[PDB]
Design a binder for this molecule. Sequence first.
Ligand SMILES: [N-]=[N+]=NC[C@H]1O[C@@H](n2c(SCC(=O)NCCc3c[nH]c4ccccc34)nc3c(N)ncnc32)[C@H](O)[C@@H]1O
Ligand SMILES: [N-]=[N+]=NC[C@H]1O[C@@H](n2c(SCC(=O)NCCc3c[nH]c4ccccc34)nc3c(N)ncnc32)[C@H](O)[C@@H]1O
Ligand SMILES: [N-]=[N+]=NC[C@H]1O[C@@H](n2c(SCC(=O)NCCc3c[nH]c4ccccc34)nc3c(N)ncnc32)[C@H](O)[C@@H]1O
Ligand SMILES: [N-]=[N+]=NC[C@H]1O[C@@H](n2c(SCC(=O)NCCc3c[nH]c4ccccc34)nc3c(N)ncnc32)[C@H](O)[C@@H]1O
Lengths: 254, 244, 263, 262
Amino acid sequence: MKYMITSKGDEKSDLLRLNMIAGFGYDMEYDDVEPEIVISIGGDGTFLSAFHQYEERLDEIAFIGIHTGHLGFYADWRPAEADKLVEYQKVSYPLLKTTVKYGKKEATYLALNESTVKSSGGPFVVDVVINDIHFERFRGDGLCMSTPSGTTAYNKSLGGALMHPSIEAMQLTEMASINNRVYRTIGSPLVFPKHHVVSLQPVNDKDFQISVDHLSILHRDVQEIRYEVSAKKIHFARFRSFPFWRRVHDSFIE
Amino acid sequence: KYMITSKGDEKSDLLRLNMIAGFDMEYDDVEPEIVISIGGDGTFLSAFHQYEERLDEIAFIGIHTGHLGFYADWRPAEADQKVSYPLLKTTVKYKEATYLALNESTVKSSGGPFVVDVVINDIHFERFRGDGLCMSTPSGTTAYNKSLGGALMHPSIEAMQLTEMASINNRVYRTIGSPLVFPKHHVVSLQPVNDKDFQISVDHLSILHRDVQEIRYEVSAKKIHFARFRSFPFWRRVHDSFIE
Amino acid sequence: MKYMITSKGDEKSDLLRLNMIAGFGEYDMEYDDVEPEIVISIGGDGTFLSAFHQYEERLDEIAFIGIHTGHLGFYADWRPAEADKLVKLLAKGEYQKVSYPLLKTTVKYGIKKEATYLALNESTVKSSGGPFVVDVVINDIHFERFRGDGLCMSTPSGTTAYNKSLGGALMHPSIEAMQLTEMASINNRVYRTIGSPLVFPKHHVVSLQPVNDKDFQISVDHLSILHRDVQEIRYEVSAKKIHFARFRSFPFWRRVHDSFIED
Amino acid sequence: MKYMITSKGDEKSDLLRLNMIAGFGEYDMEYDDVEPEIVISIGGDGTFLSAFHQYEERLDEIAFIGIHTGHLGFYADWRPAEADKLVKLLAKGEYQKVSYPLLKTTVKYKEATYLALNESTVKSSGPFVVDVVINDIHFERFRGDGLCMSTPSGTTAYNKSLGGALMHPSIEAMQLTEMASINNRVYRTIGSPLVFPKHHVVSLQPVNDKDFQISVDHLSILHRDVQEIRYEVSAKKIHFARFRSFPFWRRVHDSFIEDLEH
Ligand SMILES: [N-]=[N+]=NC[C@H]1O[C@@H](n2c(SCC(=O)NCCc3c[nH]c4ccccc34)nc3c(N)ncnc32)[C@H](O)[C@@H]1O
Ligand SMILES: [N-]=[N+]=NC[C@H]1O[C@@H](n2c(SCC(=O)NCCc3c[nH]c4ccccc34)nc3c(N)ncnc32)[C@H](O)[C@@H]1O
Ligand SMILES: [N-]=[N+]=NC[C@H]1O[C@@H](n2c(SCC(=O)NCCc3c[nH]c4ccccc34)nc3c(N)ncnc32)[C@H](O)[C@@H]1O
Ligand SMILES: [N-]=[N+]=NC[C@H]1O[C@@H](n2c(SCC(=O)NCCc3c[nH]c4ccccc34)nc3c(N)ncnc32)[C@H](O)[C@@H]1O
């Protein structure tokens, strides 16, 4: 079938890539337009690029991650096992939908790890609105809405909770909240189920640094930033049994 | 067919009498379909553990005589569909003993250090050393779980959350630090290392267990049913409690 | 004696400034922004920080005074309505001086020369884009290899600021120390960090040494500039201290209570 | 000079203890367990804490030494394989002395005072609710499991597990950390750990219940009808015997980070 392979850039990834492509020279044809199997070689950062490269056809693509360096949560296959990889089950992980409104039109984005909103320099002040209901007035560095699979990324470093990627939900964590009598925040991470909409509304400044995984751009004149669990899912190709918690253990505990 | 529990104070007992007077409703504490709690969340917990054997045929209603609770959302000046929340199944192994929790289930030592092996799905995850561990229900996240640094999750999510209690987290006993949220059919097994005497607590019930071989945690198939008359959002209840 | 007054910029602060200057004009007070002995900041903590760095070359000859036109600050503890009593007490010289410790930041390059900075609140170091990875060396001894957003070294008085939002502890400004806090540490198998904030005494040096990237985004009291080809970043408690003019007694813990709990 | 040795209890501690006593049998060392000048602890930090309270009324005439039979401790810095060197070094009388600050715990109901090397915690006997007073000034009303006041050297103990900051023992201060605070509309607490210098008094005053489970280090007691719990940096200090540079941060490193040569 149709497939394609992306590379990190280093010699180890490109050499391993060419080594695998020649292996398919079976009934496998290389195609980067309409692939059925996308293979990422490098790390989680490399895998994220492959996700956004083919986010228009997530329903017809199974992803496979290979790490040339340290173990990743997406790139979970060693280069020494590249021979065996060249008949599988499909595992689906939830994604995050980020919608931005302006003063025009609106923009939507898909996240595999998380989406963060920070200030354009000074203090980040927004009103956190949960399901058309005011919850808190936040003041700090920013806010982080994480995917289940993305909880082991930025979310964890921010003191968030680790969620199993079988749970369809999203998690909101604080970034250096001042948390005083004027700007009282919840402090605890908040996990939202499906059909729940978290709305971030400006108070004074209208310019925000919205980031989606590995892409941070400046959005001017922002009226609203809404978060909710996307209906679209990312599909993986399961060959062996590598449990999520086991993958967490090998990463942080060892 | 229904029944009514009371906290113990005069305000709760007298209000209870008024509700009986209001009720083709036959008062039956044997096989009730409607259980009404009067007092607070603590009183509500007592009503839950009173009928664990018939949680599938009972809809609960909470009335707070004191401050607002997460389970008692009805003011006493209002005595005049079903919503299901997940539960936590706690199994202690020696003949095994099982317990159901509405808020959470914590395991501490019987005096000295608390040292166990955290096993996730028959696979060792970490060796814990500290005060103890806390496995919380979705609805119980706004309780002890929050104080321990745990995350707040909406009760519509069927899962369980494990949080640390003063982990030493060093070379020998490296822990994850972050709270862990486990879905359905996931089993967290806590296995002793040396001392096998632990102070296992289920919600408001803290009992001492001797000769413990294994403590297993998993989301129970049984769910607690509430009676929804109005619409009080979970996040609004969190807002009114911690954000004033 | 010689004095000067800085203003936030709004009408209220500027108005208060002119009236105080006229107030001092009734006594033996000379206005001088070049070599003053008393620097009065009118506005907020941010305004106070600007006045600090404006005269960081003569901190030994200056007693600072903060006046908050808005909400109460940790550096600006005087209300505008007390400006009249402030002038009269300043003119007589009826006040004692209280000293707060400062943080010394030293940046080394691939010999550029060598840059030094003084911080009243804190000094932070982050990357210039990607992952921030450095080796934390405490007193010429390797302590940890850090990977994350960055690191924040705070002064005692600066603990109630960015430090607190990062989970740092609150120290009384009488304690001569500095506090290092983590900024979103990945803290895994490869990059194991302490997690806990670290309080260092005087004469202790925390050296941050690069692993791959030499470019770092260093900020001193929100003066964030890009430093290229960085060889070393050293942290130590400065021998220089900031001097305040004390007329009454506003306890640090009360200022903490009035700011984060209730007022 | 006069010395004594405490033991954990196991075979390793008792055997190593006998070897040292016999080791001092070639030098001018008098063994005395009632009025010693050098107290040696064999076992762990728990053993050291026991040796501290055993001779806490003569802290001015005693320099302590710790030997860890198991993992590295913050008070037991010496290895069992270095016991041979310790005897000769102690006999030669060649060592500088290092002093660590202590925590003074006062319980009023007559007045009871306690000295802590690590920390002093106060819990309930149900909900623990007290009013935290800092220098005769109300700061917050706490509600949770309890409160922990830690010594500088004690910051690496329970204080670290509670999320407190690590302080160098050269700093004469004390640190207050929360224990499972509820922090809501009614009971708003600071959250952050608080570090107090000398001459600063932290007063814990009851709200409803007067009974509290007050613990000082290993000693966990129960005080009834408590009116006030006072915390302040004690004037008394514990003295150590230094032979070689073993930095505090190294002990922190070798305990929480990694120990590659072990
Ligand atoms: N604005 N201003 N003045 C700079 C002061 O801001 C304090 N400081 C900072 S400065 C670092 C920064 O760029 N943060 C992005 C958001 C932000 C900038 N300035 C803030 C001031 C208050 C609150 C948020 C910000 N962040 C924080 C922080 N999250 N919570 C508390 N306090 C901070 C820090 O003490 C610094 O000295
Ligand atoms: N009782 N007692 N033990 C004395 C030392 O134990 C230290 N201490 C304590 S005492 C409070 C307590 O009952 N903890 C329950 C579990 C436990 C007891 N002792 C431990 C020692 C190490 C680890 C866990 C325990 N907890 C802790 C704590 N989580 N992490 C570190 N160290 C602690 C505390 O500093 C005290 O100095
Ligand atoms: N036992 N009991 N009561 C039942 C509920 O009390 C809730 N729960 C507890 S019970 C554990 C305990 O023994 N804590 C000592 C102090 C305490 C006891 N009950 C409390 C209730 C509120 C606040 C403090 C206590 N602690 C906590 C906690 N620190 N912050 C929040 N909520 C808690 C917990 O959810 C439990 O299910
Ligand atoms: N790897 N990679 N690509 C970007 C991903 O990196 C993850 N991500 C980030 S991105 C936010 C950021 O700019 N942080 C500054 C330093 C940094 C950039 N990328 C990093 C990757 C690992 C560690 C630090 C950085 N920070 C973090 C974080 N502290 N700990 C864990 N993971 C993070 C985040 O999930 C993002 O999706």
